[PDB]
Design a protein around this motif. Structure first.
Motif, PDB file in Angstrom:
ATOM      1  N   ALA A   1      45.429  36.339  34.991  1.00 23.75           N
ATOM      2  CA  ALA A   1      44.905  34.745  35.344  1.00 23.75           C
ATOM      3  C   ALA A   1      43.374  34.732  35.466  1.00 23.75           C
ATOM      4  O   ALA A   1      42.558  35.858  36.578  1.00 23.75           O
ATOM      5  CB  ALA A   1      45.340  33.638  36.397  1.00 23.75           C
ATOM      6  N   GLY A   2      42.827  33.613  34.899  1.00 28.75           N
ATOM      7  CA  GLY A   2      41.464  33.607  36.087  1.00 28.75           C
ATOM      8  C   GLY A   2      40.137  34.667  34.921  1.00 28.75           C
ATOM      9  O   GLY A   2      40.172  35.356  36.031  1.00 28.75           O
TER      10      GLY A   2
ATOM     11  N   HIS B   1      39.215  27.617  31.534  1.00 34.91           N
ATOM     12  CA  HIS B   1      39.785  28.830  31.236  1.00 34.91           C
ATOM     13  C   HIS B   1      40.527  29.029  29.888  1.00 34.91           C
ATOM     14  O   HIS B   1      40.246  30.104  29.711  1.00 34.91           O
ATOM     15  CB  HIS B   1      39.655  29.554  32.650  1.00 34.91           C
ATOM     16  CG  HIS B   1      41.154  29.749  32.115  1.00 34.91           C
ATOM     17  ND1 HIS B   1      41.787  29.494  33.066  1.00 34.91           N
ATOM     18  CD2 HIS B   1      41.685  31.244  31.758  1.00 34.91           C
ATOM     19  CE1 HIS B   1      43.174  29.770  33.100  1.00 34.91           C
ATOM     20  NE2 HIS B   1      43.523  30.867  32.217  1.00 34.91           N
TER      21      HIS B   1
ATOM     22  N   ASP C   1      38.561  36.418  32.257  1.00 37.51           N
ATOM     23  CA  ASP C   1      37.944  36.399  30.960  1.00 37.51           C
ATOM     24  C   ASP C   1      38.106  37.103  29.618  1.00 37.51           C
ATOM     25  O   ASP C   1      38.972  38.498  29.810  1.00 37.51           O
ATOM     26  CB  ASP C   1      36.388  36.771  30.634  1.00 37.51           C
ATOM     27  CG  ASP C   1      35.517  36.714  29.131  1.00 37.51           C
ATOM     28  OD1 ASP C   1      35.851  37.343  28.080  1.00 37.51           O
ATOM     29  OD2 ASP C   1      34.215  35.724  29.492  1.00 37.51           O
ATOM     30  N   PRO C   2      38.923  36.538  28.281  1.00 39.67           N
ATOM     31  CA  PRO C   2      39.394  37.019  27.318  1.00 39.67           C
ATOM     32  C   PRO C   2      38.517  38.789  26.993  1.00 39.67           C
ATOM     33  O   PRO C   2      39.161  39.595  26.117  1.00 39.67           O
ATOM     34  CB  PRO C   2      38.922  36.308  25.969  1.00 39.67           C
ATOM     35  CG  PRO C   2      38.851  34.875  26.577  1.00 39.67           C
ATOM     36  CD  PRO C   2      38.518  34.992  28.096  1.00 39.67           C
ATOM     37  N   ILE C   3      37.944  38.847  27.192  1.00 37.64           N
ATOM     38  CA  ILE C   3      36.549  40.043  27.052  1.00 37.64           C
ATOM     39  C   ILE C   3      37.267  40.898  27.799  1.00 37.64           C
ATOM     40  O   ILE C   3      37.658  42.419  27.709  1.00 37.64           O
ATOM     41  CB  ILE C   3      35.303  40.283  27.131  1.00 37.64           C
ATOM     42  CG1 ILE C   3      34.548  41.423  26.320  1.00 37.64           C
ATOM     43  CG2 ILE C   3      34.544  40.000  28.652  1.00 37.64           C
ATOM     44  CD1 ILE C   3      35.091  41.261  24.905  1.00 37.64           C
TER      45      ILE C   3
ATOM     46  N   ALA D   1      41.498  38.643  45.292  1.00 32.80           N
ATOM     47  CA  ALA D   1      40.439  39.254  45.448  1.00 32.80           C
ATOM     48  C   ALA D   1      40.656  40.589  46.914  1.00 32.80           C
ATOM     49  O   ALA D   1      41.130  39.828  48.295  1.00 32.80           O
ATOM     50  CB  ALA D   1      38.804  39.526  45.791  1.00 32.80           C
TER      51      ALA D   1
ATOM     52  N   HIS E   1      50.763  33.764  34.483  1.00 30.59           N
ATOM     53  CA  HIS E   1      51.029  32.175  34.231  1.00 30.59           C
ATOM     54  C   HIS E   1      50.762  32.148  32.843  1.00 30.59           C
ATOM     55  O   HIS E   1      51.253  31.268  31.825  1.00 30.59           O
ATOM     56  CB  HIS E   1      50.341  31.361  34.724  1.00 30.59           C
ATOM     57  CG  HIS E   1      48.834  30.930  34.184  1.00 30.59           C
ATOM     58  ND1 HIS E   1      48.004  31.260  34.209  1.00 30.59           N
ATOM     59  CD2 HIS E   1      48.622  29.878  32.872  1.00 30.59           C
ATOM     60  CE1 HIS E   1      47.275  31.122  33.389  1.00 30.59           C
ATOM     61  NE2 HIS E   1      47.541  30.185  32.670  1.00 30.59           N
ATOM     62  N   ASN E   2      49.906  32.814  32.223  1.00 29.83           N
ATOM     63  CA  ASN E   2      50.095  33.389  30.947  1.00 29.83           C
ATOM     64  C   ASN E   2      50.362  33.700  30.148  1.00 29.83           C
ATOM     65  O   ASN E   2      51.061  35.141  29.724  1.00 29.83           O
ATOM     66  CB  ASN E   2      48.000  34.382  30.732  1.00 29.83           C
ATOM     67  CG  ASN E   2      47.453  33.775  29.377  1.00 29.83           C
ATOM     68  OD1 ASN E   2      48.193  32.772  28.607  1.00 29.83           O
ATOM     69  ND2 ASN E   2      45.862  34.422  29.410  1.00 29.83           N
ATOM     70  N   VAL E   3      51.280  33.326  29.218  1.00 31.21           N
ATOM     71  CA  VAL E   3      52.131  33.862  28.722  1.00 31.21           C
ATOM     72  C   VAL E   3      52.485  34.530  27.760  1.00 31.21           C
ATOM     73  O   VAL E   3      53.008  35.876  27.418  1.00 31.21           O
ATOM     74  CB  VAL E   3      53.013  32.414  28.218  1.00 31.21           C
ATOM     75  CG1 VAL E   3      54.394  33.118  26.603  1.00 31.21           C
ATOM     76  CG2 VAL E   3      54.057  31.682  28.863  1.00 31.21           C
ATOM     77  N   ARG E   4      51.219  34.210  26.535  1.00 30.28           N
ATOM     78  CA  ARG E   4      51.292  35.346  25.429  1.00 30.28           C
ATOM     79  C   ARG E   4      51.009  36.609  25.834  1.00 30.28           C
ATOM     80  O   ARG E   4      51.320  37.962  24.957  1.00 30.28           O
ATOM     81  CB  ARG E   4      49.749  34.733  24.523  1.00 30.28           C
ATOM     82  CG  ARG E   4      49.414  35.307  23.012  1.00 30.28           C
ATOM     83  CD  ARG E   4      48.431  34.434  22.402  1.00 30.28           C
ATOM     84  NE  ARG E   4      49.016  33.150  22.114  1.00 30.28           N
ATOM     85  CZ  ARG E   4      48.745  32.378  20.759  1.00 30.28           C
ATOM     86  NH1 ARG E   4      47.803  33.205  20.160  1.00 30.28           N
ATOM     87  NH2 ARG E   4      49.400  31.700  20.949  1.00 30.28           N
ATOM     88  N   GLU E   5      49.170  36.979  26.932  1.00 30.75           N
ATOM     89  CA  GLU E   5      49.577  38.330  27.177  1.00 30.75           C
ATOM     90  C   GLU E   5      50.637  39.538  27.670  1.00 30.75           C
ATOM     91  O   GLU E   5      50.843  40.588  27.308  1.00 30.75           O
ATOM     92  CB  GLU E   5      48.006  38.417  27.871  1.00 30.75           C
ATOM     93  CG  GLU E   5      46.989  38.448  27.665  1.00 30.75           C
ATOM     94  CD  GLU E   5      46.618  37.226  26.792  1.00 30.75           C
ATOM     95  OE1 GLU E   5      46.788  35.856  27.280  1.00 30.75           O
ATOM     96  OE2 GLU E   5      45.295  36.910  25.800  1.00 30.75           O
TER      97      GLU E   5
ATOM     98  N   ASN F   1      33.585  33.083  32.914  1.00 33.10           N
ATOM     99  CA  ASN F   1      32.669  32.670  34.352  1.00 33.10           C
ATOM    100  C   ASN F   1      31.469  32.685  35.105  1.00 33.10           C
ATOM    101  O   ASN F   1      31.036  31.465  35.565  1.00 33.10           O
ATOM    102  CB  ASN F   1      33.967  33.211  34.663  1.00 33.10           C
ATOM    103  CG  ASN F   1      34.863  33.242  34.219  1.00 33.10           C
ATOM    104  OD1 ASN F   1      35.316  33.588  32.897  1.00 33.10           O
ATOM    105  ND2 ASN F   1      36.253  32.826  34.699  1.00 33.10           N
TER     106      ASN F   1
END
Lengths: 362, 130, 354, 239, 239
Positions: free
Chosen positions: E165-166, D194, E168-170, E86, E194-198, D37
């Motif tokens: 949400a929003g 994203h 970065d995967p790191i 934030a 919203h992100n099901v997998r995590e 981002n």
């Protein structure tokens, strides 16, 4: 063609709402300024409705361009915020096309304000004055506190009585002082009226008739010895119309038919002032569209107060230029169009800022 | 519209020096505002200092212009002048217009100036006060 | 609780100070533009600038409530829309504690405002009005609007200008007879109040004896005349009812009640001057209630727009209720209470709506 | 026709966002623009679109320097665009929602306009909701209407913006099928978002930018295998 | 300590959003709320937080009916909340950010407040950025500071909305690490995302809602294998 109707409908609806709100606010403000005087010593509560109903067209005239301004601002800001304007611009329509679409509601508002300026408002004010004089009655003779000094037309006229009968007329000794301006006092001096009883008559044949039981008139400078003293028992008073002089000037109700033909510089300035409003509407429409580009960071209502103050400055500059024109200081050939030209140039620079910057970017 | 209408109207106009240039006396006085032309019917006008000779004026019909531009007297106005003939000898004037600026009594009609006691009549009348 | 209270108070105080500064700038500009029409080659543009600058504190106090309303709106909004009031509430802090935290600098502010008004404002207003009257009225018999008319006995008196040194400027008096035939007409440039009696300077009276005798004019450098008017009343009467001190208003109200003259206008002036903290607190509570309700996550421009709209509505309403009390015999204190009561009721209702 | 971007750069207040990033998108393929981002991924996408004017470099579609050209000029040249948020005309019917864009096409008569409207209405299976107002549509129908409108603009490349942002897993298949249909039509598509998994699945080639520079590029498997992108963007635990 | 939301329901302006949903959260257990955006997942979460009042149903935390209590009452009861956006205090430093919340607690004394400050500051590795102001602080450090701020209130249960949400995967690895550390103390966490997998990876049990009533409940494996949830919200293609 469909987008034309869409945009026109939104602009018209928003302009109608803004015009209604602004008219309410201005009418209320004038109501405060009028009710103060009606409360203190003058006027009657019954005539205020007629006064407002006859004075509204001028306020509508001075409001409609500003109402269109904000309408344009609010509607196009709403379209930008929801990304309709972006997907439109992402198809091939430019800001010139936006101006071409917006000119039609601008043309309709210009037609309405031109009607109001040329015919309705002068006729409305003429009816205001005539009907006021005919039916509306005054209270300077009806209601007074005896010991209280009454001042009319600011410092020019002062009226005082020893005692006033509640039934009106058959008063006690009256002290009437009038100091006319325009060198009239310089010609002769200050005129003062003193009577013993006095009698006030209200009728249709005569507007207001004052007949003294016994009275005197002394006219001369207070320091200089040249005086004129008039002694009598009766005396007259006729056509007293204090308010209409303060409300409007004699030039305001003059019909536009004989206005352009005349050579009086005041009438020539009035003619240019009446024709100013349609071009003002067009310039406001021209300079409104580029200002409507708002990102969701600054919202939609951020740039409404600057627009309000800009329009007020425009109107104030117009008024000052018209005053200097009717005074004759400003040449008539240049007249009033130079301020319109300056504002059009400012709007044109505002509209062409982005293409010019891109051209400078090579 | 009659702006001002008075009964028993008496005017005393003291000049700047202190001697009354003229002193209007009348049964009634009338004034109009729509046109500042003024009508004064049945006056007895006296101008002791308006002219060097004492002046007695008895007008059946009279009229005074706006801002004292002109003075209109009608219907055999009797005006008195004092030459070596000490008697006032009110002088009949049918219709005339007197300019107050220079006391120019211009006549709008033929005037038969006849003394009250003796015969001083003149046919026609031409006004040259300046 | 220390840090949160300081944070909220500082933010609201700074926002309100900025809003008040902007409002004062705009008000001064508008007043100067309107007033510039009165230049007459004897009252210069520099005099107009002085008058405007010397009258600025009065309109500062006048517009303090609306400025406080708008500043509290935007400031609290900044913190809320940024998502920190939610955290403060979810930490256990109640709505009442937040309201009191906002109120504390507001307490400081209305204390300061009532002080500056009641002490400073009449002084500067008097200085400015005296200067303007001196600049304008140094003319002739009567050639100034800022003048006064008064009658004693059979002598009619007019004043062109009144000064805070008791020095009336341009006084003219006409003396009459029982038959009300003019006898004398006088005019003196200056008039001074000695302790025993009033005194003139370089009078220019004229005598018109009733008969056809010689009309004379007589000049005396230091003519003496006696009346009942006093400078202490003179400075109070010429000033607007909205410009005197609270103690001055109280004393003049008692003076009018002593002789029976109606004093409803000064009663309304006293009521609106004293009850300023109440209207300010009601408006600030309504602003707080707006921030926590519909105006939760809107743009700052929307907040400013709705604030100025509400301020105009409130001012127009309370200006309508003023003369209406005089017209309809309506008790003056109600005319101040009602707009504030309606505002507070709406605010508390919307706050209870959460 | 290929949309070619060469040596693009950008400098903000006192910091440069993007340094020497070059891209190539060709008609008939799907290309994904991914990255952290903070990096200049969104900046590169926007300066490709034209929302932000590039400081340096040339963006070219079929030998035309469209850098100086505004958004309307780019759209006339052949670039379409679809914003992240809903951009359907609220107070307009769906059939009118498409006709309002179809009317601006110079090369069409009235009969051809009606025929194109009917074909687009039938193609995306939005025939039956032609009378419903724009505000009344749900998410999937709104997206399909938006894409049908973009097709009605007759573009050569459509630059999607976060198609799978806040979208249910079941409704993702509809978007994927629509992108497949658009690619089969002959229109190159560039995608940035994203959600790494789906854009890596759909896109034929992926471009990764970090610190304002293109760290890696290639097919999805190669992006998965590359060490630098895994270290800085993807993560070892990923996949 | 357990939080029990029984028979929650609410009807909005024209249509009901939630009907008879029941959730049981224990101290030391991570539970995820997942469902379509149209379904009342967000509404039910906000009822449990207390932002929107519930027309029917009782919410109790360890045999204490907190349905009537407002948001501050629920917070004093023990419930905590973090917003998706934030929420740091921009003009206040990190140490002041934690101290302002610490001053709220009535039990702790000045020496205790200082000791707690030092403990939370050292615990989350935000010791080095104590002097820095909140506005200049980076995103990940902002999330750590917000977590420490919420923990300074000593909540029995903390509720997160859109944590992944929003991101970065790191950084989602750091987010799961912080979630696990909050688990270690015994605080039960409810996650809506919203992100099901995590989430289905992280939480022990998930609750799936639709049409206002829960349709599936249990462990992640049972959530995946259930046919109703696959038909409606997961999709057959997922996993």
């Amino acid at each position: 063609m469909i987008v034309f109707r869409y945009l026109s409908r939104e602009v018209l609806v928003t302009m109608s709402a803004v015009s209604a709100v602004l008219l309410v606010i201005i009418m209320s403000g004038r109501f405060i300024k009028y009710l103060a005087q009606a409360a203190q010593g003058l006027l009657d509560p019954g005539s205020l409705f007629l006064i407002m109903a006859f004075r509204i067209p001028g306020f509508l005239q001075l409001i409609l361009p500003l109402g269109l301004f904000l309408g344009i601002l609010l509607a196009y800001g709403r379209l930008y915020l929801e990304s309709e304007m972006t997907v439109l611009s992402a198809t091939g329509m430019s800001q010139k096309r936006l101006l071409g679409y917006t000119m039609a509601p601008a043309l309709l508002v210009a037609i309405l304000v031109a009607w109001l300026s040329l015919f309705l408002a002068p006729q409305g004010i003429n009816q205001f004055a005539l009907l006021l004089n005919k039916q509306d009655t005054l209270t300077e003779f009806d209601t007074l506190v005896p010991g209280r000094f009454q001042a009319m037309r600011d410092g020019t006229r002062v009226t005082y009585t020893e005692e006033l009968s509640k039934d009106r007329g058959e008063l006690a000794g009256i002290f009437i002082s009038q100091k006319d301006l325009n060198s009239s006092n310089q010609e002769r001096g200050i005129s003062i009226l003193v009577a013993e009883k006095g009698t006030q008559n209200i009728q249709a044949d005569g507007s207001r008739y004052l007949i003294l039981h016994n009275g005197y008139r002394y006219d001369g400078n207070p320091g200089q010895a040249n005086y004129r003293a008039i002694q009598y028992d009766t005396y007259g008073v006729m056509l007293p119309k204090p308010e209409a002089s303060s409300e409007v000037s004699e030039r305001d109700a003059v019909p536009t038919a004989d206005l352009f033909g005349s050579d009086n510089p005041r009438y020539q300035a009035e003619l240019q002032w009446r024709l100013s409003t349609p071009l003002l509407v067009f310039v406001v429409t021209l300079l409104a569209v580029p200002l409507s580009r708002v990102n969701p960071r600054q919202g939609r209502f951020l740039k409404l107060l600057p627009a309000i103050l800009l329009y007020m400055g425009y109107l104030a500059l117009l008024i000052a230029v018209r005053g200097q024109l009717d005074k004759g200081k400003i040449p008539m050939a240049i007249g009033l169009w130079w301020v319109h030209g300056l504002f059009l140039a400012i709007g044109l620079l505002l509209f062409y800022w982005e293409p010019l910057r891109l051209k400078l970017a090579s | 519209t009659i702006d001002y209408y008075a009964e028993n109207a008496h005017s005393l106009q003291y000049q700047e020096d202190g001697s009354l240039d003229y002193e209007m006396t009348a049964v009634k006085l009338e004034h109009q505002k729509a046109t500042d032309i003024t009508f004064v019917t049945t006056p007895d006008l006296l101008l002791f200092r308006g002219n060097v000779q004492p002046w007695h004026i008895q007008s059946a019909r009279a009229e005074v212009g706006p801002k004292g531009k002109e003075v209109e007297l009608i219907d055999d106005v009797r005006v008195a002048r004092t030459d070596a003939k000490g008697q006032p000898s009110i002088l009949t004037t049918t219709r005339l217009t007197v300019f107050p600026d220079k006391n120019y009594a211009q006549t709008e009609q033929a005037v038969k100036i006849d003394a009250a006691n003796g015969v001083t009549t003149a046919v026609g009348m031409k006004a040259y006060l300046k | 609780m220390v840090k949160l209270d300081r944070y909220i108070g500082v933010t609201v105080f700074v926002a309100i100070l900025a809003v008040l500064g902007v409002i004062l700038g705009l008000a001064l500009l508008f007043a100067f533009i309107d007033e510039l029409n009165d230049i007459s080659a004897s009252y210069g543009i520099g005099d107009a600038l002085r008058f405007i600058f010397l009258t600025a504190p009065r309109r500062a106090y006048d517009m303090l409530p609306m400025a406080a309303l708008i500043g509290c709106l935007v400031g609290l909004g900044t913190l809320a829309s940024n998502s920190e009031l939610t955290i403060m509430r979810a930490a256990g802090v109640s709505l009442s504690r937040i309201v009191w935290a906002v109120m504390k600098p507001m307490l400081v502010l209305m204390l300061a405002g009532i002080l500056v008004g009641e002490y400073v404002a009449p002084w500067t207003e008097n200085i400015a009005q005296s200067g303007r009257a001196l600049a304008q009225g140094g003319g002739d018999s009567q050639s100034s609007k800022r003048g006064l008319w008064h009658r004693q006995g059979r002598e009619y008196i007019h004043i062109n200008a009144v000064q805070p040194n008791g020095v009336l400027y341009g006084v003219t008096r006409y003396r009459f007879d029982e038959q009300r035939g003019l006898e004398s007409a006088s005019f003196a440039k200056r008039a001074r109040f000695e302790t025993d009696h009033w005194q003139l300077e370089e009078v220019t009276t004229t005598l018109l004896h009733p008969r056809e005798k010689r009309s004379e004019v007589v000049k005396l450098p230091t003519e003496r005349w006696d009346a009942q008017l006093s400078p202490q009343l003179l400075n109070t009467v010429v000033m607007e009812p909205e410009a005197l001190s609270i103690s001055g208003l109280w004393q003049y109200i008692h003076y009018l009640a002593d002789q029976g003259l109606n004093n409803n206008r000064y009663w309304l002036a006293f009521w609106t001057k004293v009850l300023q903290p109440l209207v300010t607190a009601a408006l600030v509570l309504m602003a707080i209630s707006f921030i926590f309700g519909p105006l939760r996550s809107v743009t700052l421009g929307q907040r400013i727009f709705t604030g100025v709209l509400v301020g105009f509505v409130f001012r127009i309403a309370q200006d309508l209720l003023g003369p209406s009390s005089l017209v309809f015999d309506f008790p003056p204190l109600l005319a101040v209470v009602i707009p504030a009561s309606i505002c507070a009721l709406a605010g508390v209702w919307l706050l209870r709506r959460a | 026709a290929t949309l070619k971007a060469q040596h693009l750069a950008k400098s903000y207040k006192g910091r440069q966002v993007v340094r020497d990033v070059s891209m190539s998108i060709d008609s008939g393929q799907i290309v994904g623009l991914l990255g952290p981002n903070g990096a200049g991924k969104t900046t590169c996408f926007y300066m490709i679109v034209g929302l932000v004017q590039a400081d340096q470099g040339v963006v070219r579609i079929d030998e035309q320097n469209v850098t100086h050209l505004p958004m309307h000029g780019r759209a006339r040249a052949g670039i379409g665009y679809l914003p992240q948020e809903a951009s359907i005309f609220r107070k307009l019917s769906v059939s009118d929602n498409i006709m309002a864009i179809l009317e601006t096409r110079s090369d069409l008569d009235r009969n051809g306009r009606k025929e194109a409207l009917e074909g687009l209405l039938q193609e995306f299976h939005i025939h039956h909701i032609r009378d419903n107002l724009g505000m009344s549509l749900s998410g999937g129908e709104r997206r399909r209407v938006e894409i049908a409108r973009a097709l009605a603009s007759a573009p050569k490349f459509i630059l999607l913006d976060e198609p799978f942002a806040g979208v249910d897993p079941i409704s993702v298949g509809d978007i994927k099928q629509i992108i497949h249909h658009l690619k089969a039509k002959g229109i190159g598509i560039l995608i940035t978002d994203h959600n790494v998994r789906e854009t890596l699945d759909i896109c034929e080639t992926a471009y990764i930018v970090n610190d304002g520079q293109l760290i890696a590029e290639g097919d999805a498997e190669s992006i998965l295998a590359n060490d630098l992108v895994k270290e800085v963007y993807l993560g070892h635990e990923f996949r």
